[PDB]
Each structure stands twice: as C-alpha cells, then as structure tokens.
Amino acid sequence: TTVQGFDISNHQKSVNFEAAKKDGAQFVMIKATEGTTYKDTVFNSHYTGATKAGLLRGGYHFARPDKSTGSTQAKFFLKNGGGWSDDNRTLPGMLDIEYNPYGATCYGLSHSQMVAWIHDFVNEYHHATSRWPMIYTTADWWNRCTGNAKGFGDKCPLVLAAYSSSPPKTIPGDWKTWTIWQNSDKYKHGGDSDKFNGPMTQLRKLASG
Numbered sequence: 001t002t003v004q005g006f007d008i009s010n011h012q013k014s015v016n017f018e019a020a021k022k023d024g025a026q027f028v029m030i031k032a033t034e035g036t037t038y039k040d041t042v043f044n045s046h047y048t049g050a051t052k053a054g055l056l057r058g059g060y061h062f063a064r065p066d067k068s069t070g071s072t073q074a075k076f077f078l079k080n081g082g083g084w085s086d087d088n089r090t091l092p093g094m095l096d097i098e099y100n101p102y103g104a105t106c107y108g109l110s111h112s113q114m115v116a117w118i119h120d121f122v123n124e125y126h127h128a129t130s131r132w133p134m135i136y137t138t139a140d141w142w143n144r145c146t147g148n149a150k151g152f153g154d155k156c157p158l159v160l161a162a163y164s165s166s167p168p169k170t171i172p173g174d175w176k177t178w179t180i181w182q183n184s185d186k187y188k189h190g191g192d193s194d195k196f197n198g199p200m201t202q203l204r205k206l207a208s209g
C-alpha cells in the first residue's frame, strides 16, 4: 500500500491542510530555502498550517550547486526550516536536486563535482541532525548530472519524480526502490502529489528514524 502526501512552496499562497488531511493526505514537504540566501516566504505559514492540521511535515531545499558548497546550503537550510527532531511530527529534510531553472545544464558541474556537492550537503545534514536527508530527483537528471552515481542508496531515502499512472520503472543509482514517488505536479489541494511506499506505521518510522 501507499500513504498519500504532497509538496508545496510559495507557488501556493494558501493551502487548506484540513481539507487535504480529510482527503487522505498524511504528510507534506514544504519549500524552506533555495541556494544560499533565498528563504521561501510562505514556508512559515505553510508549516504552521500543516502542524495545526495534524500532518507529518518537513522542509525542503532547492539546490543551486553552482552557488556554493553542499555544506553551505545544508547549513542555510538547517537554520531556516530544514531542521529535524524525533517529535512525532517531523519528516527528515529533503534535498531537491534536479533541473536547473536558470538555464545551465547540471549547474556547470561535472559528474565528480556534482557527486561531491551532494555528498557534502547530505553529510552536513546528517552531522547536524543524525538523519540522512531525503533526496528528490528524477532518474533522467541523476543519470545526466551524476553519471547515475551509487553511494546514496543505503542512507538517503529517494523521493522519485515520474509523472504517470504507473509507479516508476527506472530506479536511479544504487537505490533498491523509492521511499516517496512524486506522481503528479497537479494535486487537488495544492502543489505536487506524493506517495509514500508502505503503510502509515512505516511512514512514522521514516519520521522517527
């Protein structure tokens, strides 16, 4: 089975979390930061709204690997919504690492540079929180920009975007399978639709570690 969730950002000015929860959504990932200085200005309102509605929630960071080291961006994310504790409410932070919206393929980095950047981000995140962050990407992007790199599969939960009625057939890297599948960019209650791989009990274990 799966558990329904979703992800949102300042592109959604207002979200009815109560309505999403009534409709089966149990968790939400919320954009907190991007690059080295951008704070998503709706994050606070979303995160509070999600908390009051009883959803599991966590933050996500939009990576811009050309702008700084992975550790710098991890630290910025951690100070601005990307934190985690075992409080029954919190998903580990998610690194959104994929297509550069600013028009340079793979952010101008080589495979080895990109793999190093992502290692730097995820290691900093783990150092600070004791949790490996989730990695959000597509199989296509992971192949192009990392050379389909192994080494993250046994530590970082994979959040895999592949818009389809059927679950993803191509699993990147050395991941066994996805932890969360982003199945559409058109969710009724706002943002993107997500599906956690398993029952609620396993989702609560993703939250607690």
Ligand SMILES: [Cl-]
Pocket (backbone or CB within 6 Å): 098, 099, 100, 104, 105, 106, 107, 145
């Ligand atoms: Cl790219």
